[PDB]
């Protein structure tokens, strides 16, 4: 049995707010640790809060 998760929730709601993780400014930022969402949730910054 499967429904919605909770990582997907705040990921989708944070990507609703203009963020991104791949092509953020113009450079390829997939590997850069201060941009993908899992680090923003483990650091748990002002934004996810």
């Amino acid at each position: 049995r499967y429904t919605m998760t909770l990582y997907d929730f705040i990921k989708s709601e944070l990507i609703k707010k203009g963020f991104n993780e791949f092509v953020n400014d113009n450079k390829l930022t997939f590997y850069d640790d201060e941009f993908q969402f899992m680090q923003k949730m483990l650091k748990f910054d002002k934004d996810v809060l």
Binding site: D8, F9, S12, I15, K16
Partner: peptide, 27 residues
Amino acid sequence: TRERYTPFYDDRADYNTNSKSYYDYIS
């Protein structure tokens, strides 16, 4: 047979359905 989910991908669509269940959101 042998039901596999051969794609496993990433999405970019967003959700807060202000609703009690799936059902009431369909309504």
